[PDB]
């Protein structure tokens, strides 16, 4: 499937096999949240991120 859709065209396609365990991540990728307290606009938050 990846070979078929190598050309982006107008869509971004990611093909994944379903998780072996629902609600779990095999890679262990951390989930990190950076909380803004001053109240900066989301554009500035995205720039900093």
């Amino acid at each position: 499937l990846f070979g078929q859709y190598a050309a982006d065209r107008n869509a971004l396609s990611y093909f994944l096999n379903l998780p072996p365990i629902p609600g779990l991540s095999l890679t262990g990728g951390f989930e990190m949240y950076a909380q803004n307290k001053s109240g900066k606009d989301y554009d500035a938050i995205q720039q900093d991120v």
């Binding site: 803004n36 307290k37 001053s38 109240g39």
Partner: protein, 49 residues
Amino acid sequence: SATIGTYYVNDFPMLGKNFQVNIRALGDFRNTQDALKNIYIRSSDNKMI
């Protein structure tokens, strides 16, 4: 309530969280017992009473 007391109309945004908006008369006017004399209200005939 608005002149003598505190009237919480709605909320306004500051530092992300919502904070109250309160209407009250200047403390000097509410001090005396005869504060009612200074206060005014408009009848249905658009006359101040």
